[PDB]
Design a protein around this ligand. Sequence first.
Ligand code: CLA
Ligand code: CLA
Ligand code: CLA
Ligand code: CLA
Ligand code: CLA
Ligand code: CLA
Ligand code: CLA
Ligand code: CLA
Ligand code: PQN
Ligand code: SF4
Ligand code: SF4
Lengths: 165, 41, 742, 62, 80, 143, 158
Amino acid sequence: RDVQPYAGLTPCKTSKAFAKREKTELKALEKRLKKYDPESAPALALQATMEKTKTRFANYGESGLLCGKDGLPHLIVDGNLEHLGEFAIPGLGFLYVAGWIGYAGRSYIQENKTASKPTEGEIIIDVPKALGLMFQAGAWPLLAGLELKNGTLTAPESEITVSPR
Amino acid sequence: MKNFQIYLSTAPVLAAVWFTVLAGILIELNRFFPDALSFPL
Amino acid sequence: IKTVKIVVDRDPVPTSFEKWAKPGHFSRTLAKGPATTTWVWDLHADAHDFDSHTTDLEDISRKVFSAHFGQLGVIFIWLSGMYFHGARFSNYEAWLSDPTHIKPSAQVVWPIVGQEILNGDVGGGFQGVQITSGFFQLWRGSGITSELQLYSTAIGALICAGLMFFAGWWHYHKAAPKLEWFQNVESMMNHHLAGLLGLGSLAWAGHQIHIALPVNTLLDAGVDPKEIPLPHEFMLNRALMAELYPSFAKGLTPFFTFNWTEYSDFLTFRGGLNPVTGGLWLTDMAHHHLAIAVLFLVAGHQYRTNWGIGHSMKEILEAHKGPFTGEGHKGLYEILTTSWHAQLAINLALMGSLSIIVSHHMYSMPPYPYLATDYGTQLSLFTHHMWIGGFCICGAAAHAAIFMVRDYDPATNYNNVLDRVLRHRDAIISHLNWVCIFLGFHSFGLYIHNDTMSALGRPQDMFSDTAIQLQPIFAQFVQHTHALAPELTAPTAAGSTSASWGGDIVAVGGKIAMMPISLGTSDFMVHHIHAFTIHVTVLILLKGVLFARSSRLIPDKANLGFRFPCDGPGRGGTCQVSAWDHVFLGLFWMYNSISIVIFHFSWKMQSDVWGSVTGNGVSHITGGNFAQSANTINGWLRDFLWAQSSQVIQSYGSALSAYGLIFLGAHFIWAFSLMFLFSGRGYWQELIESIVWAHNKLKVAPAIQPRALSITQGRAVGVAHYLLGGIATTWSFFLARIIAVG
Amino acid sequence: QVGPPRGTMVKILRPESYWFNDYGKVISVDQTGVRYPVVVRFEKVNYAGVSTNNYALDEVEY
Amino acid sequence: SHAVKIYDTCIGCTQCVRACPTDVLEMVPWDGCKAGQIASAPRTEDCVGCKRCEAACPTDFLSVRVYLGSETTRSMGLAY
Amino acid sequence: WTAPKLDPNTPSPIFGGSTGGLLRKAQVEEFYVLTWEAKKEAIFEMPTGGAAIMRKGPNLLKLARKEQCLALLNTFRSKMKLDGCIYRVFPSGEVQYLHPKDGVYPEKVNKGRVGANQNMRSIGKNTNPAKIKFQGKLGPFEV
Amino acid sequence: DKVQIVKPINGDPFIGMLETPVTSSPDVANFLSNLPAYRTGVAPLLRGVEVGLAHGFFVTGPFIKLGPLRSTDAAELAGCLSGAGLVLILTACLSIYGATAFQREEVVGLKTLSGRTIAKDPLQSSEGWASFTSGWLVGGLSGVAWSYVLTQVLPYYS
Ligand code: CLA
Ligand code: CLA
Ligand code: CLA
Ligand code: CLA
Ligand code: CLA
Ligand code: CLA
Ligand code: CLA
Ligand code: CLA
Ligand SMILES: CC1=C(C/C=C(\C)CCC[C@H](C)CCC[C@H](C)CCCC(C)C)C(=O)c2ccccc2C1=O
Ligand code: SF4
Ligand code: SF4
């Protein structure tokens, strides 16, 4: 895709410095290659590395990246629609995954707190129940919203131990 | 046998297995979808 | 006089996973369960504290024996891995044909995240991580010419590891020996001299003679490894072996008639280095191992076991007493036959000193073909064995202190050689501290005065070679006597033990295998620095051991334990009083000293030994700047740290980029250790209280209560990360530098 | 008999207590007019590792 | 010297007294606790400040407290 | 316990000497004497360092600190189940009965002891240091 | 018959010292006892005289042979003036030590190892240490001057 220049950053696809970066790396690869005869396995490995570099640079060109004066891609994280894949979408993926991990943990700690000996189950994890809670934590945002609305997400002030101050 | 399974269910062994598997999946994703600076669109 | 015999309890413990399912079974406080997060660290800390688990010494001895079996199984796994990688993941066969120009490499990385760049151009139509363990040189010196031989011994090593584990299981669960078995030290020495060292050295001498010697002779002559006859064709075909070395045409007749002079072609005393490979003469090494075998076989018949001939070590201890030492060595036999920690202290001290000597003797007298020429493996081996030695010595101090707190009994040590040491520990520590101060003041002012004079523009007032001659006259004398040893005091030696003493610089393929080492004023100053740093480490460790049970500050310290954080802020403050804390500081200084030893080694070798002869004199790596710059701290900062760091910091984009990343990471780990070192538990516990409040707010409060690390554990983590970061920084620096410069 | 019966959960009101604002089972209450008669047992240990201590009648709530 | 104070939460378990390495603490009769005895610190001048009493006190919060103050020879624990 | 036990010239334990003994502080300031009755001859550990043999019957031992004397006496009581008393000796030549300071070990409640340094309140009921500001007070603990 | 050499100080095994061939050997004891510091019956001034002479004599030598002007012809004069300056500093140190050190009674006496009661050293007093300091000053300056003379006079000096 063709992205508009933003914050004084030209698109990497049409950036001469991006082409120079690609060129330089590829030439370095060639130099590394030259000492190896083509039949030997390092020669093929280096040619595959060159291919990988070319397709990486091409993919970065097409992915609507903005490059700077240095010639390397720069991320726009202000929320711009043209660069949402830089931070927003992977940000949403992280927020979903991290909240899943945390909610699986919270659910297991609350469930194990009802056991006869909670601290032993804290180190010897009940794998079937654990996995059940882990897969139930797929709908973490919903269940967290329910806990927030019902007031059971947060313990009241009086129950929590505090310093004498 | 069952006790050994319980031993496996211990925190260190389970952490090692879980992070071994996780590193495996992440490495496989970086092999089949390599060099991903950003989510494409 | 108990008879030495084999004693065993049959099936003492059943083989079952019930204890695996229950963490902390070995203890009583840890067995009940985790109340707080301190329990995890307590579990791991006393995992191998067998004395604190069971009171009886029999069970402890069985646990130690089978744990040793498990360690040996682990070591055999590691050896199997190294040989297997040298077979399927290396260029050993290519390196065999061109050892001078092909970089050894036995690790290849998977091409996943761009890490394939670490597969450097090591030569031979191969890419991988260049290795510095010297394993290729070892295999070449052992006569290995094919990857199948490496694979075969790797599989053997894996089988042996399985056998070692099976032996540990057998000797804990099936055939655990009784306590009276382990206490047969006479028999132990008889076997571990005659049978472990004696027969082991004999076996290796036989290998060297029959396998390594012909194969390496053919390699020296220029024969292709793929054309060399196989080792069994030399060991069995006597005509084939006699073709290379004509003494084998006489069989064993000269051996059994004391006509051993006929074996002089393959059992030599040449001394020096092989001019083609740059390693010790393999005939010399074979003769060496033969004589070592004989000496140990004879020395292993010293002690009486079951027949009246021999020595009793108790008697020869007790008979050594004198006017200054009271009862002398009486009671030490009881110490060292009823305390594992005492034996562990002695054995660790000697192992550490030995590893140090091993490093010295291997750089100076390279025992492997194309080892000296490969500067990277030589530096790596020296630095490695130095660090192992310093660590083992620190552990020796620790276990000496552990014995002193736990297993020392005043009743059995009344007026013996140990009790009198405990009765004038004040004099020992004060004199050592005085020595330590003196040494530091003199040596540091030797550097600081020089820094000051140079900065003031007064080079004539410096302690350099030009201005003030602090010449190491005694070391130069020793060098002279050793260079002249083959003429007067070692007449049958065809040459000196090392070329470092003097004359006839050894070069292999342009690069210098070995060069005579000079000793100017910078060598004097750095050696007195070494002595200073050693003496301070010894001060710390010996103070910890001697004041392990009591002091004028805390008299009741023995019952506080070997490992306690303090006795309180009273008496002005009683922090770090335990002998464990002395090992902490002792460990720190050990690290500091090694850091100077290996820096001296690296700079001196790069400047005055390593290099390349081009027919117009030596072209050293750094150009001989050590003698004129290593007399100033600025000189070490600039011409050694700053100058030689260019390889590691500019390593990005090459195969040494991993070394650069480790350099940064080890810097981080060292600074991260400073967190644990400069802080205290109270702050971290209160921060945990706030964080626990935050968790309790959301009902995420763990059942196991979060706790700050114990003060001892905080110090432990601090010293561990400090040693890790410092050593790994030096590792990355040394390896990147010496691999890039070559 | 005064104070909480045995077996009930009492909320600690002593500000300095490790288990302040926490709930603990009453083991026994001393009726001989001692200053801190209420013995309260706690699932979780303090920094000293103990799971119980004594409280007055106004330092507990049920 | 330091200051050692005994508070009425003391249960008279004697552990502070048994833990003291300088004989600063002693048990005295007292009607306030069930055990019938409270600790006291008559020989406060001998308190080195090692705080073994606080470490050995089971009551939460501590019934014995040591406050480091003016440092004398005995408090500094000097053999010289 | 009508009167404190006086200090006689009783034999000292067999010891070969050490560098951990009395310093000049014994000469200028004070030193402490530990005396105990031994049921049998046995080898004990000096708190200064080294091993000494105690004599059957009464023994006398001079040490630099009260802590050393009390540590050794606690060893004797807990291991050998002995009885001992401690004196403080000044350079002027006046001894001073120290241990147990009552004729009864402090851990055992004894009649006649008067509570010293007792605050009849919990630790949290101490006032704030701002209220005792500009007063001759050690702290909230002393009010 | 199985002689033990190292013994406790004066036979008392409960004092922080041990008598060894370095401490209680007859030759060592006679040498130390004959040094001026241990001549307690002699006037502190004259003991300070000898002390100053010995100390100021040797202390000049390091400045002569290793000072900044060691190469110049004025090496000796510089080194001797350095030695005199150091003697003056040490005189200041002695004066302040004498003012501060002897402020206590020290009620305990002193005896010899034979058990003979002896009087305290007059040197170990404020006025005695003042007299010792004056003797130190005179002796140190005389010794520095003598070192200068000998460096200018002695035949085999170089
Ligand atoms: C390669 C990618 C990468 C990696 C390795 C990490 C790694 C980490 N992140 Mg980061 N992060 C990333 C990308 C990444 N992050 C991106 C792209 C974003 C933008 C969304 C974030 C935003 C982010 C935040 C906001 C936080 C982290 C935190 C953390 C740590 C714990 C995360 C976790 O799942 O714990 C397991 C998860 C839990 C125990 C549950 C805890 C709550 C989680 C973190 C969020 C759920 C709350 C909810 C959605 C509301 C969010 C409010 C927020 C917007 C302020 C860990 C070091 C946390 C941290 O260390 O801070 C102290 C943290 O608070 N990350
Ligand atoms: C049950 C999981 C869980 C949850 C939901 C939380 C939630 C929280 N923690 Mg806690 N924490 C946890 C575990 C958890 N923590 C663990 C295991 C540790 C020890 C490393 C900590 C150490 C810790 C510190 C030091 C701090 C927090 C803080 C916070 C808050 C900020 C967001 C965050 O998590 O960033 C912090 C995220 C991390 C430190 C990463 C650790 C989380 C790991 C990945 C979870 C491991 C458990 C996992 C889910 C498996 C168990 C379940 C399974 C058997 C089914 C939030 C209340 C901060 C705070 O007070 O903010 C107000 C803060 O300062 N946490
Ligand atoms: C599968 C076979 C098997 C089984 C079921 C048992 C079962 C038992 N053994 Mg036996 N043992 C075995 C094999 C076996 N052993 C072998 C092969 C050896 C020789 C090493 C021993 C040596 C031995 C000793 C010396 C002792 C036992 C003890 C025990 C008991 C405690 C178990 C425990 O807590 O360990 C659980 C421990 C682990 C799971 C950790 C295992 C770690 C291994 C040994 C080290 C290998 C290297 C390691 C992986 C390196 C780490 C590096 C990493 C960071 C990369 C239990 C009855 C103890 C006892 O009290 O008996 C009553 C005891 O003192 N065993
Ligand atoms: C000729 C006799 C002989 C030999 C070679 C050894 C060799 C060894 N002993 Mg010793 N030992 C002997 C007799 C012998 N022992 C006797 C008589 C006793 C009883 C008094 C002991 C008691 C003893 C104890 C208590 C311990 C050892 C240990 C060790 C090992 C130390 C590690 C080392 O250096 O690795 C060298 C490594 C190798 C040589 C590699 C191969 C390893 C195998 C095990 C060598 C085989 C030796 C064995 C005696 C012969 C097989 C007999 C078997 C079939 C019954 C070493 C393998 C320690 C150890 O590590 O425990 C396992 C240990 O704790 N030994
Ligand atoms: C441990 C080290 C070691 C080993 C194993 C060997 C081994 C050998 N050497 Mg070497 N050697 C060594 C050290 C060693 N050497 C040293 C240190 C020196 C320097 C002095 C020499 C110098 C030397 C010379 C100069 C010569 C040898 C030779 C030999 C071979 C002759 C063996 C022979 O017939 O003698 C007699 C051996 C025996 C009688 C033992 C055989 C017993 C068998 C195994 C009994 C099995 C019976 C069984 C119970 C039942 C049978 C059936 C069953 C298989 C199914 C042999 C391969 C000779 C040779 O040919 O080399 C090329 C030769 O000329 N050696
Ligand atoms: C022959 C060698 C030997 C043997 C048999 C022992 C055996 C023992 N030691 Mg000794 N010790 C040794 C060497 C040895 N040590 C050395 C070389 C040192 C100097 C460092 C010490 C210093 C030492 C101290 C200071 C103490 C002991 C203690 C102990 C006992 C308990 C150990 C335990 O369970 O901890 C299990 C092991 C650990 C908890 C260590 C974990 C790993 C650490 C952090 C290092 C890992 C570094 C690693 C290589 C870097 C990479 C990490 C990577 C994953 C990132 C046990 C008797 C302790 C004791 O109580 O004695 C009775 C004790 O306090 N030892
Ligand atoms: C560069 C930092 C540094 C320095 C200078 C010192 C210095 C010292 N340490 Mg420390 N130490 C350090 C870092 C350092 N340490 C660190 C980080 C650790 C880890 C915790 C330790 C751990 C430690 C322990 C555990 C021990 C020491 C000991 C010593 C002393 C050893 C004797 C010595 O060096 O001779 C004398 C001192 C020096 C040479 C220091 C430099 C002084 C120079 C030469 C200036 C000379 C005078 C100068 C002209 C000033 C006069 C004029 C001025 C007034 C203007 C000395 C006081 C040991 C000790 O005290 O026993 C002897 C000991 O036991 N240290
Ligand atoms: C301890 C280390 C050390 C040493 C050996 C030296 C040595 C020297 N310095 Mg350097 N210097 C040092 C540290 C040191 N310095 C440090 C850390 C600094 C601070 C930055 C300086 C700064 C400095 C400056 C600025 C200058 C020197 C100068 C000198 C020289 C003359 C000094 C002088 O007059 O001494 C006087 C010495 C003494 C009064 C006595 C020395 C000690 C005696 C000999 C001990 C003998 C004890 C004996 C063995 C005991 C016997 C007992 C028996 C009777 C029973 C000399 C070469 C000067 C120069 O230019 O000359 C080249 C100069 O200008 N130095
Ligand atoms: C940082 C620090 C702490 C705080 C460190 C805390 C208590 C522990 C370190 C953190 C570990 C990593 C907690 C263990 C985490 C669990 C194992 C959870 C699983 C891990 C998931 C996140 C993957 C101390 O307690 C301390 C004490 C004494 C001197 C110095 C210090 C000190 O410097
Ligand atoms: S103070 Fe703590 S320890 Fe001493 S008696 Fe009162 S309660 Fe028991
Ligand atoms: S501080 Fe040490 S000495 Fe003072 S009372 Fe508490 S324990 Fe006894």
